[PDB]
Design a protein around this ligand. Sequence first.
Ligand SMILES: [Cl-]
Ligand SMILES: [Cl-]
Ligand SMILES: [Cl-]
Ligand SMILES: [Cl-]
Ligand SMILES: [Cl-]
Ligand SMILES: [Cl-]
Ligand SMILES: [Cl-]
Ligand SMILES: [Cl-]
Ligand SMILES: [Cl-]
Ligand SMILES: [Cl-]
Ligand SMILES: [Cl-]
Ligand SMILES: [Cl-]
Ligand SMILES: [Cl-]
Ligand SMILES: [Cl-]
Ligand SMILES: [Cl-]
Ligand SMILES: [Cl-]
Ligand SMILES: [Cl-]
Ligand SMILES: [Cl-]
Ligand SMILES: [Cl-]
Ligand SMILES: [K+]
Ligand SMILES: [K+]
Ligand SMILES: [Mg+2]
Ligand SMILES: [Mg+2]
Ligand SMILES: [Mg+2]
Lengths: 239, 200, 196, 234, 233, 202, 213, 216, 248
Amino acid sequence: GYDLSASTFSPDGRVFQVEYAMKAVENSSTAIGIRCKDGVVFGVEKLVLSKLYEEGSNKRLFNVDRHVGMAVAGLLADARSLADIAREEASNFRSNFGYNIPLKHLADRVAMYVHAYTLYSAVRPFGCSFMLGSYSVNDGAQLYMIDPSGVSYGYWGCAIGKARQAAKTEIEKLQMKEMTCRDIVKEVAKIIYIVHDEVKDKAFELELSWVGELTNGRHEIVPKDIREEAEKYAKESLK
Amino acid sequence: TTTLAFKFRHGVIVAADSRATAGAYIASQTVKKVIEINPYLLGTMAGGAADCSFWERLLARQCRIYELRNKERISVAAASKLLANMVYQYKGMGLSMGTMICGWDKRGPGLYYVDSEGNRISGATFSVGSGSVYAYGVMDRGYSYDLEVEQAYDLARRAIYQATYRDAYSGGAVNLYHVREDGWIRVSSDNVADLHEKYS
Amino acid sequence: MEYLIGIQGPDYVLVASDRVAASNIVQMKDDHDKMFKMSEKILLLCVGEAGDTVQFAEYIQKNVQLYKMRNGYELSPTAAANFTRRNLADCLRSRTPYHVNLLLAGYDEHEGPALYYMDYLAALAKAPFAAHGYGAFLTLSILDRYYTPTISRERAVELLRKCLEELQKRFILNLPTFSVRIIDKNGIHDLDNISF
Amino acid sequence: NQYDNDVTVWSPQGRIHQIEYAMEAVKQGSATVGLKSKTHAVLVALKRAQSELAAHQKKILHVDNHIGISIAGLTADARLLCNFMRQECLDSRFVFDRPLPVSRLVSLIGSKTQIPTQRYGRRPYGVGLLIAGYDDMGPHIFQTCPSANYFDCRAMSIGARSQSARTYLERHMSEFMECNLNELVKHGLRALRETLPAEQDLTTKNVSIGIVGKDLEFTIYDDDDVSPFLEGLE
Amino acid sequence: DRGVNTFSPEGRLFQVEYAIEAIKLGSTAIGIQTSEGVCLAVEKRITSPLMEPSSIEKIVEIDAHIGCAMSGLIADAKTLIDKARVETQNHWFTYNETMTVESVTQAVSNLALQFGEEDADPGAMSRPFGVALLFGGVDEKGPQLFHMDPSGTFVQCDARAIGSASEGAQSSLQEVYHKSMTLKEAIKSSLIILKQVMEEKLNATNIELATVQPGQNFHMFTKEELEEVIKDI
Amino acid sequence: TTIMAVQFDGGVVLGADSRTTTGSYIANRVTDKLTPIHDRIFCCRSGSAADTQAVADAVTYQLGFHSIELNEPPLVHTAASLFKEMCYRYREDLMAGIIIAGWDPQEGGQVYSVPMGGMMVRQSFAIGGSGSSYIYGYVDATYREGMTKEECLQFTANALALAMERDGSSGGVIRLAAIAESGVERQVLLGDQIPKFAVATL
Amino acid sequence: RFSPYVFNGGTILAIAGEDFAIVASDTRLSEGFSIHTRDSPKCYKLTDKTVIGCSGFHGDCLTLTKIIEARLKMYKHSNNKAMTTGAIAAMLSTILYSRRFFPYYVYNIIGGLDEEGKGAVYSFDPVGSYQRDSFKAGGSASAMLQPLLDNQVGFKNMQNVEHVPLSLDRAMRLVKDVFISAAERDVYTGDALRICIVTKEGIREETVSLRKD
Amino acid sequence: TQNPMVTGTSVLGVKFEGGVVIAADMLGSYGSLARFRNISRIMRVNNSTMLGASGDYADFQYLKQVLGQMVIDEELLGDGHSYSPRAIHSWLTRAMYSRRSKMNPLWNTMVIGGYADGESFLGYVDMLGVAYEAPSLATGYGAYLAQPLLREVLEKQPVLSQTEARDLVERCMRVLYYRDARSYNRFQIATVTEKGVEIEGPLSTETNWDIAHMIS
Amino acid sequence: SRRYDSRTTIFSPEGRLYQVEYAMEAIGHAGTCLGILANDGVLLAAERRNIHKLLDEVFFSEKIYKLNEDMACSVAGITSDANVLTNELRLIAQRYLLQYQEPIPCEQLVTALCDIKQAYTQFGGKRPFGVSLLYIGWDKHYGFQLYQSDPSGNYGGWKATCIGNNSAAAVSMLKQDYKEGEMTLKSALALAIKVLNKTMDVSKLSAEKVEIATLTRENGKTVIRVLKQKEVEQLIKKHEEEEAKAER
Ligand SMILES: [Cl-]
Ligand SMILES: [Cl-]
Ligand SMILES: [Cl-]
Ligand SMILES: [Cl-]
Ligand SMILES: [Cl-]
Ligand SMILES: [Cl-]
Ligand SMILES: [Cl-]
Ligand SMILES: [Cl-]
Ligand SMILES: [Cl-]
Ligand SMILES: [Cl-]
Ligand SMILES: [Cl-]
Ligand SMILES: [Cl-]
Ligand SMILES: [Cl-]
Ligand SMILES: [Cl-]
Ligand SMILES: [Cl-]
Ligand SMILES: [Cl-]
Ligand SMILES: [Cl-]
Ligand SMILES: [Cl-]
Ligand SMILES: [Cl-]
Ligand SMILES: [K+]
Ligand SMILES: [K+]
Ligand SMILES: [Mg+2]
Ligand SMILES: [Mg+2]
Ligand SMILES: [Mg+2]
């Protein structure tokens, strides 16, 4: 069989091990990012598998540099390892060149690292997709997404995980280019509630983060009071 | 420091002073310079204090391992050789150690001189340390393979004593051991001030 | 300080060495032996720095004996000399140089007796007779004066005894006893020590 | 099947069977419980005894003055990981002269244990840990898995029949924060006791306890030292 | 065929399981811990009268206060025994004190899962050790017996058997052991049990026995000292 | 050597003498000490010619590659940072005193000193090399905030000329460059074009 | 030539009693002709039963004590018990010798209780030569303190005096006297004297004022 | 560094009730040449900690780079733990010792000031890993000229107000300008309290030259 | 990667090393190559496989290699593998000479190469060399010598032997005609031709189809020569004259 190693092509030119790693991301619950006028907002449907867990356990939103957030789906241990790679890359860039790594370059660098795990029998592909978001006055708002093959693109809106398509269709309804981060957080929460399957998976925590003019270009958790208002708006909107 | 040893009919006599110095400062008068490698083997210490203590302790470790692996007592020849081979790699790095490895094995009483310069030699009598020249004079004039046991104790004790008297860097007490066919014994410890009283 | 001598006759090589091991102003041993048997018909005589001398000689000795065990027969005096030289020379510019001066004496079934001289730099010279140490300065001319290539072993020991008497007379060091050995077709023979 | 022998082989469902198999090593271990109040973090463990004349395997290990662990799965992997944790703790006191925050140590475990899940010829760690600690953010109970995932817990149980212990803990967890220490350890014991066959009981030979908190360095209680805690399960 | 570090669906390393099965091919050894010391006894398993019995050594001295009995693939035990010996001597060297039985056992057991074919040095261990070990000794905790197997799991035991007839021998051990039993009683009991389980007739040349006591160093029983004990049995 | 750079609103001016000496032999009398690192970023070199040439070549490589990857012009600050990293790291094996100057769209004209030892500091104007000693007083007294490009050029040419008169290790021609959004303009002052200040006869 | 060492001063002292040990040090930290601080003790608690005094090059004192602290924990983790006073002493010997060719510029004196509950003092050179002593002075004023201890605790050079056991009270009075004498003549010894008394009950602390000049 | 190049002179520090103040001139000297006359020799490390460095300025810039990055790394985790001033001083002790032990020192003498949990922190670290804490510190010539004045005031009154500590530091900076030929009359004062770290400057002392007419 | 590793260096269930055996099958198909020891010398004779008309003839032989002053070899099996091994032989022989300042004794050179071959059967996961060699030489310990080695790293000394195509048949004819202690180079030569004549039964023997080298001693020096085609035809002629005598 042709699907056991990332160093073997199938007869049709596929690399099934990379496709299988993508299936792990596709089994995961949904994360979304939206770029808007003045920043980027992330939301995650964070399934709570036991009531014994603390609020905040198994975060899927990370700070990878002071200006850069990361939102993940897939195998969480692989994602965290990638967050460490991203951190190290941002750190090394600052030490060598003396300024904050531009988002696009950071995306391209980590994507090549992911890519390097798709060529060899010696290692396996990462079972994770992740978004990177930042904001500065010079570069504006930027949102990138990187998948297990190592492809990297920029987005106005993005979703990863199992209700990806349903999320995208809701994101498409927003005129995000003209909205602010404060307006968008509510819409992020709304969309997570829409795509959540309340029958099949019973309990989730909404996780929210942002980076924008309003945080002065720092990636930060959305404050508690603003998250709660956004949940309440999403919940009532579901009605 | 002054240390001596000699083979004779009844085994091997081993003796030492007990002074340690840091330059001209007397750091101790109660140092043990004869180390008990096992119940049939002793090592004597002269030169760098840390160097002697460390390398003889390591020799002891190795001799014990040997004995466990091979199921028999290491010979005096093989023990002395282990020490020589250990220190040889460090020549030129400023280790300072002069030791006598004293035992009784299948070849009978055994006595090897080993030092940090690389020397390893078997012989009947040796003295090592800053006071060795003074000990040699006395030991040489009284030594005989057929010394009686108590005469041999007297000679060793007197030679170290006389070394402590001339050599600023030797003193304290004279510690004396006797290696016999069934093991070494600790024979005496005599403060040089009490020996002075006695010898006049 | 250490004295080595060799004298090669038509069918033997005679060699001698002092028996002192000294340290600072004292002789610490007076029955020291500076000869190492490499094989039935080869002696290596080694002097120089402490540690280096035995480490070097014993390493050569074990490798010569290894060659015997591996192959069923022994290295010739000439092969052993060249083996010794390769090792010394190869170490000369290394982190572990050996500060040793040597004579190699042997008897080969087909070449007859051989005496080789080597210095710490690993220059190798075959010689009819030779010596190392400060004592060499006072004895080499005695050898040049009285040696002949056909010298008999009874006369070689006499010549040796003129050299050693000259050290007693004229050398500032106290070297009162010497090991003496001869090699021929029948291997290595111990002679009486020459003493004063 | 062709997909279950190498940690580097994804299955067509997006799973890694070697990691799932490693998790079975923890499910077959003897049960352990971890829980916390506002002020203390407690571990309680059942020790399995090979024969009737064996001591009972150590389940609870000291990591640093402020951190201890309970283990389930391959004991040799447990020691390897425990030695890693110990060393990370020593490093932090050497460098910074302060304790390694518990959540940071658990991060380091995740990163260390993920690495062999992605390289050919390596294997996951076949051990799960409950981690009790106390630092500036108060008491903690963390759980670590062979998958290299980890969890921050109000309380937890892993090992054989731990479902029962987890159920008990959910049932009473709203009481834990306000419990004094005796109360909290009692809860840990009652949870652990749910894992046992109905005949059998907690004894001084089969129970081990570990406690750390504000006033108290990580301390292990075994044999006669568990009796105070076992009496007045009233 | 799969790699040496492959887990089974039950969460066990195949190689380790298989190594535990090799222990069953060994001769039986017994350890008993009493308040007066520990004894170690082992079936030699002589396969020809031409073999020298004294060349079978399945009980070894680790240090003066610690012996070790082995069963399984005996050749594998050599590096383990040497590691224990080196470790106790290192501990003495560094700390000027004897190493505990538990500590020795721990040090050796840290080798157990150090095998595999792409983490390690140009020719590191390819498989686990096919050996089980009983460490019996005396330290400041008093007399002590510890068992270790190829999983690297180790534990203190009051009495334990290992090798071919360990089931069997372990049952007889539960039957006869008591905490206040004397050393002489434990010696008799382990020879009675070896005698049951052994295929050959027990005698003073086809077994070995050693003790360690608070008084006294590691002591291997001589032919003559075995003969004395064997009279009652 | 004497090297200098000066910031103005929209760019920078750089200058150097052209003397290279071995002992007191002049091995090159028309040295070009102002080396382009990218389209609008130059470095002025003093110290060992072997060292500053090797370091400048290396930085040119690093910066060019970085620039292609980013698809943007490079920051003057980035060029200086690359010099600093290399000059600091290898401070025990290099004798290099560098001024990095240039223009980028984000921060405009900028001057950085990387003196021996490998510290880095931004300055309004910078001087270095052996001849700089003799013009500290002059530049301190003559510098004015808000000079035009043409004034910066004159101020540079004068300072360098004074240094060159007094320092045996400086001389020859004065090389100048001005850098701005529009580009780089280079020129040489030679012979009678070098500013002249009388010897003070009785 | 960068020098990697500097002399920072300091005097240490330890005395073994029948059921106690004392470890004492001044609190001055010096460099050249200057005082860094007047409150820098040279004593470090290792266990409930063991204290170490360290003087010499402060950079090495700090590093060495942190190494010792880490090694005590490592020992406790592998062996399930605290290190004894004698095992700490043997270990220190090896840690010092590991820097045989770039030494720790530290004079160490250990004071504590042995395994029978008796006072124990161990004294070291910088490369780890050591022995047990009944009492010992170290550091800057050691040549000033030691002879007096020889005379007053060892009874040396005295005829017709009963060799009594050393009481804690007398040993305390001696410690304070010798440091006061040392503060008169050694420029490095001064400010304050810190005394640790180790007994079965634990470790207690006294401090006495010394001259500030 | 084997050979320091551009260097800074004294750094001062003193504890006061509710915080710590440190001071340093803004000069980098190149031998006797007062070469870089507007450089800051003080770093805000994080909210509770600040650092001032004497000695080689390039080496200081390196430490600032390393330490700045370490603080960012730690903030990324967003986990409620921060390096205390004592931790930073520990770290710095290790780093300097370690570089000294490779025979390749960072050529600096440093003063770490902080405030955390109601406690003022003031600590010294030198290029050899000599480190300690005290109520006041002064590196370089400050050890001879400023420290005696600091300690004399502190013996009479161990607890200073903020404004008293600030005036005392200004008096020491004046003395240093009079007597240290590598000083400069343009300095910064940095203060840490509950509220964080503030760096003020550029500052100057008044000077008096009446003694110029008292020679005859 | 465990799936692709064909495991060249492991035992099979009967204690066999399959690669080694398989390499021995490759050899048995290669050009016949014989060695014959005499009182005054030693020889090698080999079937040439380089026989197409358009070949150019540029070296002094096809399969005979000079190793040092006193020794030569021939080979049967994979040619490129033989080039590696013969290069290594020359290196070993110079290493010795450098170190001892005398020629390597014949058996010592063979054994050194055989230890390399052995290693390739025991560790490293590589295919063995598909070469058997016949070595001829003189040394001062045993005089004229003939050795044979194969891909197992095994070797032996022989008075006469054969490797390559029809070896078994060639050894039978040697067993029957070879006179222990009484052969000369001239009669060994005749015998070599007799043997090749039978064992090249595809087809009628010709000088273009064989290579012969002799190793003799002349004035205290070893002489190693490859016979010219004139001499080879003469020996073939003599053998064909001889078979005319065979009945009457
Ligand atoms: Cl997806
Ligand atoms: Cl004594
Ligand atoms: Cl051994
Ligand atoms: Cl000898
Ligand atoms: Cl001495
Ligand atoms: Cl378990
Ligand atoms: Cl296990
Ligand atoms: Cl998991
Ligand atoms: Cl579980
Ligand atoms: Cl078993
Ligand atoms: Cl140039
Ligand atoms: Cl410069
Ligand atoms: Cl410059
Ligand atoms: Cl210049
Ligand atoms: Cl010019
Ligand atoms: Cl400036
Ligand atoms: Cl800052
Ligand atoms: Cl040749
Ligand atoms: Cl040759
Ligand atoms: K000029
Ligand atoms: K004083
Ligand atoms: Mg040497
Ligand atoms: Mg250079
Ligand atoms: Mg004073």
